[PDB]
Design a protein around this ligand. Structure first.
Ligand SMILES: Cc1ncc(COP(=O)(O)O)c(/C=N/[C-](CO)C(=O)O)c1O
Ligand SMILES: *Cc1c(COP(=O)(O)O)cnc(C)c1O
Ligand code: NA
Ligand code: NA
Lengths: 410, 410
């Protein structure tokens, strides 16, 4: 029993398999992967170094590695309708780094969705390599609708004359019109890159329009809505861009890939090609809307853009607690995890933020429904109304456990 | 079972576990991780995203993550005798990219060991971000002795005035004098970074002097001689540097870590703090020595530098086949995997090369010893001289099998 050898490691791996139990996970990014996926990542493909690409390895003994990677690649092309997939990127951050390195030059101009409006760090935060290597200019949503204004974005693109437009977000509730993004890119001579990391399982379930026919390159995490292992993926229909991408990922940015995690990508993409995955995304879409109803109705709150068509939404809580930092602090005490989150034209300071962010793929994968979500969101509006009242927060927490117990995990 | 849904994948895996029994693995980089290490990265810490560093997460629900990572950090610090450890890098390549980003500017001059003598891609190859972002200038071994010549490296450092010297290699058989490297760095006002990826388990076993007291920063894979999961690690004793390193890895280069890979780094780091790990490294040293003996004796074959004091060595072949490509092709035909390799002052093409590279760490992990190692080297001599006598190659194959059969894997 290897567990005997290292007791205090495998008993932190237990405080966690239980912290995941008695937690209500509403962090929009999170999910719960199959046993098939977790098992694949724990194979002895972690012993084999496979630098290069299938039938183009640096070394031999890579025949069987080539079969497994080729599956991931083909299942990705199939699921997303792309002519080329690269499955080696270690993360979404590496996937995106490889695209910048393939299409543009150090110092070129890049338009990205602002980190207020829900851009990733790697869509131009000055802390990130993205922000330091290239000249990132953000676009926002409209101040009153909180929707993408494609006319606004065009005018800005015409003045800024970016080489690359990144679309995709971590905090945007509504359907992105990728045909309009490609039309804006085309109007100014820019490449379009769509980071679909948040919506990729919705793109796979048929519930969100695919960026793949409109983006020059589409990047994604294989985790989040797509509910695969942590890692990255690049898709393109353009064979020249494919060649630059492949060269950018290896040996441009990376060495040997994590063939065990690639095995786990092949698995997650078979599960996403399953009819059952449409049900899942349908259930993801409702559970998020159900949950979102509750904040709209309540007078002191406000679901952002008045609602959601994907797996998530924001909320302005600055009428009920000092800031979203506080709102978040409060809700942990009750066994509810989600995140402080800027909101369009953020009032407060970055560390504080005017409100929270919710999503539904985690609770949805734990097999929960519309009742549960409404329930959870009442518990939230409750807890934030009564942030100063620990008898209350204690009563809510007893109840959170009622439900966590009720619904399992594996 | 899960294997039900996805045969094509799980029977590709089943099959790799067979190929890694029918194989003599002599690829110097490879090892055979424990069941504890696979098992641990095939757990459900993959579900949780842990942006930031212990007690400075972005999100809550961490805390039990903060304990698994704190374990890795503290095991790495105690195993290597370093004051600071960062266990977040996804790979050796991201570990190296994070040190460049912390210590030097784009365009800054860096001296690295020549790709031909053992330079890693990330030590300045023009096809790598390393080569493209910084001014890399390589040093080589002495032409006659095939040894690092520290008077020659200082003379070049005084001409080139690098901001950073990188010591460490993928194909060097001899003890590196890390104190001479830091003496040279100090003489020209340069940082010293050591990439100990290949030797990290011999540094851990006590069989290789440590870079940690002499390198401003030390990087490594957790895989290779350290026999951990695939990933990276950064060590320093300077607190100012550790702060810069930590920003550079996140949010500089990466997003959220593979906390399940990090769990499996805590596993491996405990397997290597164990008495038994010293015995492992001793057997690695003896095993490679045994194998290098055979090539010394035989007149047509020359071991580079005349021998080895670590886990690998290079053998020349261009008096007994066209090139090393042919060498490895022939050897694969017998169930012995290793790689072609440039030898110092390579004549032939990168794709062909005058040499093979041989390592003891995998076969040592399968509980093998000196007789076995000799046989393999005998076989590799037999086959390479009888390069087109397929009666021969097949007689060997059956013997290779007798032995691969004779020794287990798991
Ligand atoms: C000294 C050093 N640093 C970093 C890495 C990078 O390892 P990753 O692929 O980024 O995790 C390597 C790899 N080397 C090749 C294949 O193992 C090889 O054995 O020649 C290395 O030798
Ligand atoms: C969550 C997210 C990522 C995560 O990146 P990692 O490097 O895998 O942590 C990347 N891009 C986008 C748009 C995301 O929403
Ligand atoms: Na996803
Ligand atoms: Na190692």
């Amino acid at each position: 029993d290897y567990k005997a050898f290292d007791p205090e490691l495998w008993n932190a791996i237990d405080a966690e398999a239980e912290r995941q139990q008695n937690n209500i996970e509403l962090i929009a990014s999170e999910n719960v992967v199959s046993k098939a996926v977790m098992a694949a990542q724990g194979t002895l493909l972690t012993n084999k170094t496979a630098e290069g690409y299938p039938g183009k390895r640096y070394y031999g003994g890579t025949a069987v590695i080539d079969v497994v990677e080729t599956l991931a690649i083909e299942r990705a092309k199939k699921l997303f309708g792309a002519k080329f997939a690269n499955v080696q990127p270690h993360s979404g951050s590496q996937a995106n780094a490889a695209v910048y390195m393939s299409l543009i030059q150090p110092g070129d101009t890049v338009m990205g969705m602002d980190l207020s409006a829900g851009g990733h760090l790697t869509h131009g935060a000055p802390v990130s390599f993205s922000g330091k290597t290239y000249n990132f200019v953000s676009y926002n949503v409209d101040k009153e609708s909180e929707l993408l204004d494609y006319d606004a974005i065009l005018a800005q693109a015409k003045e800024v004359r970016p080489k690359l437009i990144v679309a995709g977000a971590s905090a945007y509730s509504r359907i992105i019109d990728f045909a309009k993004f490609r039309e804006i890119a085309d109007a100014v001579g820019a490449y379009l890159m769509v980071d679909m990391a948040h919506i990729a399982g919705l793109v796979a379930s048929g519930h969100h329009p695919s960026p793949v026919p409109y983006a020059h390159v589409t990047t994604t995490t294989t985790h989040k809505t797509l509910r695969g292992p942590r890692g990255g993926l690049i898709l393109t229909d353009d064979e020249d861009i494919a060649k630059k991408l492949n060269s950018a990922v290896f040996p441009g940015l990376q060495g040997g890939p994590l063939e065990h995690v690639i095995a786990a990508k092949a698995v997650a993409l078979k599960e996403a090609l399953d009819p059952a995955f449409k049900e899942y995304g349908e259930n993801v879409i409702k559970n998020a809307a159900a949950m979102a109803d509750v904040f709209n109705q309540h007078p002191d709150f406000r679901v952002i853009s008045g609602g959601t068509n994907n797996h998530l939404f924001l909320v302005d809580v600055t009428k009920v607690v000092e800031n979203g930092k506080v709102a978040q602090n409060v809700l942990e005490e009750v066994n509810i995890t989600l995140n402080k989150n800027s909101i369009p034209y953020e009032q407060l300071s970055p560390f504080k933020t005017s409100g929270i962010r919710v999503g539904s793929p985690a609770i949805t994968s734990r097999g929960m429904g519309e009742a549960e979500s409404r329930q959870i969101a009442e518990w939230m509006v409750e807890a934030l109304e009564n942030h100063d009242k620990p008898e209350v927060l204690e009563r809510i927490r007893g109840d959170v456990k009622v439900l966590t117990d009720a619904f399992p995990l594996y």
